[PDB]
Symmetry: D2
Subunit: 381 residues, 4 copies
């Protein structure tokens, strides 16, 4: 019969209006300053551009060995040219109060070194996965972390991905019933021509093949989906002996595991087949299928029962949660500010590494490896 107050009170002339409804994460502040170490493929394609959607994180400095490149990136992101560090004067960041943390995005064999040096420089540390190329090196990073009394977070973006958390949540609500079989596959074609992949073929730098690089998603995903650690693993690996790509690191590798709850799992990673990111979780009441499972974008999950397939994915007009990249960056920022622990701590990064070494060991011996060493997930999966 008549227009409601609100509409009726809108000026017909240009007038100031209120703060709008927010349908997506709005920026807030830029108090937590990062220093990015290693201007590479994942840094320039996903992380740097991922800062824009942060509500607390910003880029303060760059650390690269390619002067020409740092220069370009610096200008591309408004970073002060004076904040460009090379791998030598890296430790000087300790004199810059505006640098709260570093984000190590270097090849695997170098993580430990810069994590420690960063800590000695009195800075917090975000380090990419795989954590390091040895269990011992993982522990040394943890040690150094405790010594500097600083946080240590591993770059597990899936622990901050809406769809993944959505998946973890439905499992915890028992929509799948008792869990019994988890399947995983993570693959992408290895191109030795790509600069980023060249060190991944070097065992000394990569620390391993497809399992260290992408298999780790199925392994880690298997763990937070089930909400527990495996007690024993078995594995077999094969690589074409004529393929120049796999002279030092493994191409394809399969590994099955048993958990203390009785569930089993069988996953695989591959460097010779096209894009695959698919997780399957069989319960006795329903089956969860994630595909895409660990993508940078477009994740899709579906719960299946005879005659049904209830799918879930990000919405078309609203963005209920922040994207994994921005969420991850803000996560360490928030943990520092609120004096709280991170959900993806060094211990978590180390658990995957020990786990992988066990899988490689079971692959080499052809025998099962007991992994019932009592790792406990602080905070929950």
């Amino acid at each position: 019969a008549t227009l409601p107050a609100g509409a009726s009170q809108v000026p017909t002339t240009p007038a100031g209006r209120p703060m709008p409804y927010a349908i997506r994460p709005m920026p807030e502040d830029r108090r937590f300053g990062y220093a990015i170490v290693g201007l590479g493929k994942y840094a320039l394609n996903q992380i740097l551009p991922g800062f824009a959607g942060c509500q607390h994180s910003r880029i303060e400095a760059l650390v690269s060995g390619n002067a020409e490149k740092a220069k370009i990136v610096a200008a591309e992101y408004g970073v002060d040219p004076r904040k460009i560090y090379d791998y030598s004067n890296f430790d000087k960041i300790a004199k810059d109060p505006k640098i709260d943390a570093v984000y190590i995005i270097l090849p695997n064999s170098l993580h430990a070194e810069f994590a420690i040096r960063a800590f000695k420089a009195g800075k917090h540390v975000m380090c990419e996965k795989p954590m390091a190329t040895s269990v011992a090196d993982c522990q040394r990073m943890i040690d150094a972390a405790k010594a500097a009394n600083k946080k240590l977070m591993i770059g597990y973006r899936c622990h901050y991905d809406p769809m993944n958390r959505a998946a973890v949540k439905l499992i915890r609500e028992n929509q799948l019933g008792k869990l019994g079989m988890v399947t995983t596959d993570n693959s992408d074609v290895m191109d030795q021509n790509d600069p980023a992949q060249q060190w991944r073929l070097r065992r000394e730098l990569a620390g391993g093949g497809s399992l260290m690089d992408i298999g780790i998603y199925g392994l880690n995903g298997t763990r937070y989906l089930l909400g527990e650690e495996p007690i024993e693993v078995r594995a077999y690996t094969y690589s074409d002996p004529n393929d120049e790509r796999f002279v030092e690191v493994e191409d394809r590798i399969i590994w099955q595991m048993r958990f203390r709850s009785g569930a089993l799992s069988h996953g695989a990673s591959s460097y010779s087949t096209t894009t695959t990111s698919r997780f399957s979780v069989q319960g006795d009441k329903a089956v969860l299928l994630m595909d895409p499972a660990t993508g940078y974008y477009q994740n899709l999950i579906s719960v299946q029962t005879p005659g049904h397939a209830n799918q879930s994915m990000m919405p078309q007009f609203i963005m209920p949660a922040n994207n994994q990249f921005s969420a991850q960056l803000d996560h360490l920022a928030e943990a520092v500010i609120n004096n709280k622990p991170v959900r993806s701590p060094g211990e978590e990064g180390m658990q995957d590494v020990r786990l992988i070494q066990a899988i490689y060991e079971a692959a080499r011996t052809g025998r099962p490896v007991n992994t019932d060493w009592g790792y406990v997930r602080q905070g929950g999966y």
Copy 2:
């Protein structure tokens, strides 16, 4: 047998490396400076945050009537507080050489006014849709544009959306064969409680109901999907007489059209049903289904034939094209820099408006309205 050169040459020590492969649009420069007019729902939720992924555009100034708010946004996006203009001193932007264009994101009834004023201020103009609330006002904007010798672009984000362009491309390659029936639906529940929706219920400000606000997507989409203009339209509209939301503007409205090629179409817009963005294009060889069709995210298209459904959507790890928002902003920027016309010019915005007036007219009279007035799409759909 052995590792390829590239891998073999990677230092085992921290060393500068090359520029990485780019799997997504990388930033480049920030030469084109915008001045945003109207810090509202669409501005703070989609546009402002959409600048980050631009390769040439940046935010130079803000124009708002809410001092407190502009202040906050300014700080949120690094805009110099001195570049905050209110609706009164708006014309002063003419003294700032660093402001190449304005982006009008005000309610419909105010577009014309600020587009013109912007032009008199010697600035280029990006104006949201619907263009204006009258055909005449559309023409006045065009006139003013020609007078200042500046570009006039209407905010048709779908004209820069990967999946939509992908859809336009498959139709042009005749994968659907001869086109005969196009169906569209665009709806979302109107909430008078939301500040952004309050002026949309006012005819004087909105210029109309669901057709002016969201029906325009089906209308415009119908046009670039077919690649031609309609020669006649028919329409009927209904709104619950007791619903306070629709006292001045229409809730639901249906309109069917005929094109010079023989194709027909039947679409609708709605303010009382939940989220719907679905386009259907029937050819005699195949059928295209877009759903989501015009979302901010997650668009999905599928070509269907008996026993088949070939779907397309953005990839999980690579981003072949830039997102509509960033693409749109950079589009006007590029057109200025390269002295080229925009794909979404004022004439295009005016064509939709005339078209809508015709539909409203056919709804009021209950008679068909001839729209065979020879509008020609400069550049292609």
Copy 3:
């Protein structure tokens, strides 16, 4: 831990076992005897082969005008060669008690007449859609049903299709909220060289084009999905004047309808675009998409909301309900054997015909056509 009684109680030797569990419709008897009139495309492609799955129906006799054909068919389905009638002695069926009802699968113009004739033969009538090419003929068929005091059921299989039934159930359960917009489309490329399609091009035999043949699905559907009749309708039709196929019947026609509840709808049918059968029901809580909406097999429905897509389809190992065809058949059988009214009475087929003539009028006159004539769905949609 020891095996259950039942397991350990099984003979490791050839022994008899109980009646296995039924995971799909089980055959029972063949009490009902059908006489199928007109051995055409539908009759031989879907209907006859659909008796096999019936639970209370059998093919007792045939009625063909091509004896040679009827002999070959009679063989394939093992019907008594002595029971092969013709359109002349069709009435003699009244002498066989083994023939309880007849199934008229003849052109729309020959529907009414063979229904009335069959009613005097004291038999039950299963008549294909559309009921007839005249509202009056529809009425006479009814009158001839009351007189002979037999059952009159129209071939609306969608009224017996699991998924279509699932669609109505969720809507009735208010899963979509307040219904406000329905969109339907039905299409398939008209092949004049097809013997079956040749009488559809003739308006005297078909009684209409596109709408009378497949648009009726959208029209009927909209009605049981919404669960209410239109009170007003508008429509437009167009056909290429140079296409020899639509010299007498409409190729494409679009119709808009308004309902008492306030809900609106817009649907269409086409003879010149490839396979399309899609229903869309928009509520304020969720949107339902049936696609395929009305196929012989493979129907699919989905309930959409931002971020979710809950799809339903026939299971992959079980079969909770029988196929629409066998279900339509036995439905008449059970209707009589229980003195229960049929879900698709002749009064239901009549409403569609009145509504279609009303639409053709709206299209022909170009004005609204009040269809508020107090029809009532006896038994519910």
Copy 4:
């Protein structure tokens, strides 16, 4: 513009018409006569009701150990009550020429014996999977086939399922590129109260658990999809020791296989998780996902690449190929009536059994089991 000759040449009166077009498999004859042994769950839920769709097959007689049951069934399918055999006089079938072959649908332990007996009865043998619970028994059944000089075909329906056939065709067409990883999963919650499931819990009648019953699909599938046999295999099995269901047979077992081409695979089967039938074939050009992969109905395949999902399924109005069941039946009929070898010879069912025993060994011993024994798929996968 005038209607085509055919259209205007149709009588507006009851007249005969030609044979309609066939949009689905048409019945022809019933030359072949089957004798179905063991009236169980599969026999009555899928097989018998699948003869209706056959083109060259008929149910000539039954073989039951529960006369009462066999009388009721014989009725439903109209079989001659005088042709209801028993496991004692089963051999007398050799006296009826109307019985060309028998279909053994008995527990795995009673497969071989009734096959050899039937061969002496000079009849063709259709034997369900697994062939037998012993490689030797498999061999004897074969020998008894050569002797009697009759056909020996195993019930591999997937070898006759449209979609499964579509899967092989696209792979053979190199749409996925170089095959490198296959992932299979088959599962369904074991119900001990089900008469049919009670002999599966008994390892003497079943000859194995999870793998022998459904894992065989993954195993078989992997083989025809890849189109080559494994040369080596590894596996692990685990079952809850407190579950009375898996006291004698395995609940969940996982197996990894390597192929000559270099391709690898990892698949699993489960008795304690709900419905799962998913195949995954990874190549370097695309990935194929079958899901449902091997159902009775509703199979679905998709070919994936970044940004694309090309799905295939049975059309919604047509039926290009007959259902796996009727197709499996007639396939034996046609095999004889043309002196052509069957696609699923006994030599094919034997390979699966040798491979399964090899797997059980690998799981039991925990070591690799060379399966490189020169088998060859006579006739192709």
